[PDB]
Point group: C4
Chain length 485, copies 4
């Protein structure tokens, strides 16, 4: 009698939502609003990423240009950080950067101009440095001394050194050439949503840190977006317009509703759970069951909770940046990215309503724990090889310098990548270390490819075999499916 | 009695054609004409592709030469599109292209000459552009203004600027140097089927679009094939001859006959099908069978229908191009390519007449659906990682700029390609995004290699196991094989 | 009674040779002489290959040097065949080669000298060539005309052109600069077995074939080994000595003996075979057995026959070259290589005397046929993709030019190699062909990795399962093992 | 009665240590001290490797700088060994190195100075060399003659040759420019544990060995660490301090204790073993058992013995180098590396106390022997291809020069790496060898990927199947587990 009521409640909880409408006619609003969330957050990421793509492309093209203009002897990809080994070359390159700053209106191409105005030279060298290696002696004050100078851009008189730059090269940490420029992007006039002007704050670093007769040279531009006061097109006045704000607000609306409903379904599942527990204990003195208790919990909803939280936070920060017109898009990108990932996994929630898809996702879920355990063991062997190869082959190989590069290399070697370059880039300056490199790599690659990938394949193959055998000959006993039957 | 007649008809429909001649002596003409089609379309593709290969090789060698002649500072592979960052270099390179156009008879090597005659300079810049970034202001007319000029090739007077080219560089979209040249290929005199002369229409694009202080520079030659009026060899007059036309016509003949016969066999299969249905229902009141209805349909014939249609269309377009002597071979190549692919699959029709080959092809066919479903699921996870990596690691990685490049990268990572370059080409300018790159790549590569390829292997392994078990212990019940037995 | 005699003979034929000495004490001479052959042919290949390695290293270092001396603007690896696009550069490079030939005693380093004497210029251009592309007309005599000239090396007067070289560039096929030089290798004085002096016959080819405004440039040296008349060391007279000849003769001895004994064992196996047949038929009227007839044949001996023949032939040619002192080592290398390969497989004959090794080699042999059949089918699909990708993506991809390069690429893609470079090196000049490239590559790589490698793994896994089941539960019935039991 | 005592002893020996405290309350000190050893040796390797990393980085940056200063025309990565092909270039480069040595205080950047003083030129050429290749004759004295010279660094008079260097280039083996410099590292003042000053002993080798008109050029610096007499910071006197010594001593303490206890447990296991043997024989006349005898031996302890020995030796050598302040870290690195590897495997000892981990490690151990046997067979086939490809494709391929490079290549090809570059880097100068290259590579790659990796997967899959079946249906009979039960 009442047992029948419990069977009705439970089966109503275990039936698919599409099955909860063919039988009892409950309108599936939850599926609809989730689908809305999926397409919504997707479109959000797409538009936001296209905008970022245009802005970043503008920035990258610009900084490449500034490198080819201000840095002498720059080559595409010299790690984007070439070095100089001679005093006269340091002087020639500083002079090159300055003279190319003062002729920027005559030599360059783009829409570049000045802050409207100074070019900041900045020496950074030790307060007291007296180094005598020929006598095996030195006296240092690690506290830092600074010097500076400003060239007004309207001074074409000086352009046989002219400016008063003089160096020591015994006490020196870095020279910095700091200045600022302004430009405009013209692909963005077609889209009012983007600010048009852009501020560039450039610094050229001549780094003599890590004294080795090798001065690193780098350029870095830290930028600032700005909204123009006004801008015309064919006589028509125009200012920047915002409509993405309302879109993001509607994202927060949708994800908030989904959050509320999902929490309601979780709490309902827990109340129904304890109801089952207390009812089952009371009626027949039997209730030491834990797996069924988990079966009432549904991790997918939890995935949607984490997803909704991350979408809301990322959207608030997004609105903040589009309002203040900042250019630092790093946290929102990650929150929204992870969110989307979890959302599409939600669609994999919306493929398990088929028994064959159900077979496959259940195979994956059932396999995951044993795979993680075995990844612990193989991770232990992996760590062993990582320390060993790091300490032994660090000095004699381009890789293996840092433990991270080690892990990257060994991982790639498990997955076939870049073997002959590893065998070949080794130095034969020491023969014993070279032999050990060989035993290390043959033993490693053989052990992890020929024995262990094989065992992963054995695991997933075995789980597929079992759950196939369950969809043939029935699941194992649970005492809940018995009660439903 | 009549059931025996049905067994005779059906078994006559289920027996192999080689088996339909050892028993009843029906001459297999269909196999013969299909084989003729196979070798025919193959030889077609080979000859057509060799011709295209010669023409394309001539074009490519030529355009490489024109790049090294007219473009200053060209390097093999600077993406075939090098850039310039300075006004004086733009002037020097325009001047280089012009002076190398006017000295082309004295400096070059090949058989180059002129249209018999103008060198077209063409500026393309805004009608009204007034850009003041120093004041955060600009006024634009996005409508385009054009200017032009023509240098007669017989003007060696001008060769300290001489021509009247002057630029603004604030309003500018592109400069175009358009001209035309004529040449002859001499490997083709040995083959009358090919036209000998070739027209080249060259354009040099100095692109200042996407204003970033970086002017793209490209060369493009759009060509036109031409038949010479006449051409001699050792005193013997010769003009171009065509025999490939008859060949293509015979292709259309063969494929048309195959099309007709195959459609006849499909329609016969459908009439025999409904005959079986109505007969089986009428006799014993049993006919709710759908799998047997499909078993009367044979998809291979359909493959041959699509194949024949594509061969006929591609051959008509082929004859059209060889008649009009055009140089645009893109649609015919694809129709004929896909056609051939389907034809060789037809030969795989002509390997299933052996029970072991039959075991293997049946294994593949039986496995394909479940593989496509699982490719749907894993495609969902794949899309998640694609969006996430796109938005997060777009700005800080050379890959990941566009979703397509993302999908290409992740696909390559599933199949082992180019890992250490992905781990290594990342920028450490932001540490949090870098960590996230690591979790992203380790988690991704591990998840798709160590768990999912394994599951594909489990699927095909399982299907091989089953159908092996069927060729041992017999197929499952169908109620058609029962009637035949 | 007599059946027992047959059991004794047969079991004596089926027992291992080490088992034929523990029981009946037959001295295994065959194993000993085969082992002798293994180590013998191995040592042969090693010494012969080390010698070749020294000679080839000398040649390669030399030709690299001659490239850097005589070819202007040579770069390491410009495909070893750089091109020139300008007349004046052709003149400058010819002049460079000549002047660097006449100053070779003053500019160079090594032990270079002359034939003791001419530098051969050789033009090769059409007899009659009159090409007018501006009028779409041309008259040709494809017969070839030649001109020549000789610069005596002792003419420093000429060194503003001096020599009388003049070109047309409309009729021209190739210019050839042919000459000869002599040198000595000094690593070989330490080894009397090698001739010390070396002759180099150099030709520089300026190839204007395939008229495209691009003249290929290559250097080729065809060499000739020579034995010096005499050579001293510290006052001691020395001439080249040969002892490798006797070694090779002893190789021919060993391999000949093995050949004889193996043929004797094959013929004995055939006589014993027909004896079994006739005896089995005569006694019980039962003899329609073919598998047992094969079981008396042993393919390993055949492998040793082919091996011995190839070792003898390669050794005769080897002795011929060491006698005549030629430098063409291409056929002997291949005969000896294949021979050695088959010999080490012979050692795999000498590992099947263990039941576990026996399990594995039997697994491999039992799997091979079905693998070859399935490689036929998958080869058909492979050919389809090869033709399609060849014709479609030939013009728009650096690969896919020739069917061989296609097969190499697709093979590499099956085995994971070089994906992102294939996706990325495609040209977006045509969007439809680009899309088709994508469907082509995703479909291909997915089909051959995710479904077919899986099936190979299923095959070998299945065979291992079966033969495991036979070493557990006994082999199947043969009616020969029944008679032995 | 007494059998019960034996069951108690044995089960006390077979129970886990954590199980030997939940039941009988034996304090597990061994686990604690081993864990201490794990973290200890780990931290040791980390600190030691970071120090080495700083020192090696300093050295590498330095030698790169010296290359760019003293070697003319040096390029990043010209194999770090560029060559010269002309006399005048040899003179120009020697002159460059000398003049850049004498201006080192004016041209360079770092903290470089002199020994306080000579620049050593050293010719090495034959005593008697008279080579006449034009007459096919030569007379040699392979004994070596040497010449030398010293330029005082304080001689700016000479800087139109000035120094008296003259060469022959017919008799010559090598020129050596040897000198010494002193420098200081400043990242190390922050760490008193490291000596600050560094000695560099530089040699430039112009190698004319292997006479081929190609002089190799290399730079090599052999260094010597030195402790400065004193060094100040902001007026505070400072000398180098050592605390790592005590740490290493405590390593030796821990590993020694572990060594002692482990040997005690092994010997106890052997005494208990023979006790079981003699007792089992005496009581029931049954004792021909060998597997149980091994089951009393535990290889993990042995792994810890080898580990402890290697840690102690490496630590003694470590203390020796930190005391004497040497810079040769090659043996200690390897001993400590292998040690750590074995230690983390020890942690895999500390994961087998779980039955699922136990399933996996037992799967791996049970699979290893058959994998090694099959690696013997496949190694035989591998050797065959190695010899064949070595001798045939040595001269015509960049790889395949040496047998080691062969093995590296073929190994990479088994694991997918670098196929299209192997197919493509072959020379078509000989067509037969090229075809053979194709059959070689297709046959090889197909045979080892499509058939043999498959069989490894079959092996590990089979072992997983079996031991799964044992943890389901119980282990096989041993007659020891019977006695315990
Ligand atoms: C191969 C499959 C079966 C499992 C592989 C496991 C890896 C994905 C994980 C497991 C633990 C990780 C390691 C845990 C800790 C570190 C220390 C970490 O230290 C550093 O930051 C290096 C520089 C420094 O020492 O400061 C470097 C990465 C590394 C080796 C990690 C690299 C990646 C590892 C090996
Ligand atoms: C990994 C195996 C198990 C299945 C992987 C599936 C892929 C072969 C397919 C399935 C769906 C495809 C995606 C469907 C839609 C798009 C959007 C498409 O959008 C663009 O054109 C990018 C530029 C733009 O946004 O305009 C980019 C390719 C992409 C990600 C496709 C890439 C290739 C995908 C992921
Ligand atoms: C992928 C596995 C399952 C089987 C793959 C089979 C390949 C190892 C073989 C089978 C047949 C071979 C093909 C047979 C014939 C030719 C024609 C041959 O024609 C040429 O010589 C190209 C130049 C010309 O047309 O003259 C090019 C190689 C090719 C495609 C071969 C390439 C290598 C193939 C595809
Ligand atoms: Na790979
Ligand atoms: Na792989
Ligand atoms: Na790879």
């Amino acid at each position: 009698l009442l047992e029948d009521q419990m069977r009705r409640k439970l089966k109503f909880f275990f039936m698919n939502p599409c099955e909860k409408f063919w039988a009892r006619g409950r309108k599936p609003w939850k599926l609809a609003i989730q689908i809305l969330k999926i397409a919504m957050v997707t479109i959000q990421l797409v538009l936001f990423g296209l905008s970022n793509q245009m802005v970043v492309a503008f920035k990258e093209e610009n900084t490449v240009a500034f490198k080819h203009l201000f840095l002498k002897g720059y080559i595409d990809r010299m790690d984007d950080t070439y070095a100089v080994y001679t005093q006269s070359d340091v002087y020639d390159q500083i002079i090159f950067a300055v003279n190319q700053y003062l002729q920027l209106y005559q030599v360059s191409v783009g829409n570049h101009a000045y802050e409207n105005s100074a070019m900041a030279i900045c020496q950074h060298f030790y307060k007291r440095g007296n180094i005598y290696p020929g006598n095996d002696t030195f006296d240092i004050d690690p506290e830092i001394e600074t010097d500076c100078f400003f060239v007004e851009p309207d001074e074409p008189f000086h352009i046989e050194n002219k400016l008063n730059l003089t160096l020591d090269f015994h006490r020196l940490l870095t020279v910095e050439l700091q200045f600022k420029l302004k430009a405009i992007n013209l692909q963005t006039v077609r889209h009012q949503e983007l600010p048009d002007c852009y501020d560039f704050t450039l610094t050229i670093t001549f780094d003599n840190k890590a004294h080795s007769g090798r001065i690193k040279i780098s350029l870095d531009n830290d930028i600032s977006i700005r909204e123009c006061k006004d801008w015309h097109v064919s006589g028509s006045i125009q200012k920047n317009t915002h409509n993405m704000m309302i879109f993001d607000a509607f994202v927060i609306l949708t994800c908030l509703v989904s959050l509320i409903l999902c929490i309601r379904s979780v709490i309902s599942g827990l109340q129904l759970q304890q109801e089952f527990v207390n009812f089952f204990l009371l009626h027949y003195k039997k209730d030491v069951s834990v797996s069924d208790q988990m079966e009432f919990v549904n991790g997918w909803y939890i995935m949607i909770i984490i997803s909704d939280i991350l979408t809301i936070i990322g959207s608030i920060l997004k609105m903040e940046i589009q309002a203040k017109s900042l250019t630092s898009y790093d946290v929102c990108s990650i929150l929204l990215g992870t969110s989307t990932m979890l959302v599409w996994l939600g669609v994999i929630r919306y493929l398990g309503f088929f028994a064959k898809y159900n077979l496959l996702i259940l195979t994956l879920q059932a396999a995951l724990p044993n795979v993680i355990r075995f990844c612990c063991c193989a991770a232990m062997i992996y760590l062993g090889y990582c320390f060993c190869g790091w300490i032994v082959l660090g000095p004699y190989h381009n890789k293996f310098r840092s433990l991270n590069m080690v892990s990257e290399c060994l991982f790639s070697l498990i997955n076939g990548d870049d073997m002959f370059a590893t065998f070949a880039k080794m130095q034969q300056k020491s023969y014993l270390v070279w032999l050990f490199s060989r035993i290390y790599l043959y033993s490693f690659i053989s052990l992890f490819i020929y024995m262990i990938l094989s065992l992963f394949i054995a695991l997933i193959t075995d789980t597929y075999e079992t759950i196939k055998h369950y969809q043939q000959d029935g699941f194992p006993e649970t005492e809940l499916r018995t009660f439903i039957s």
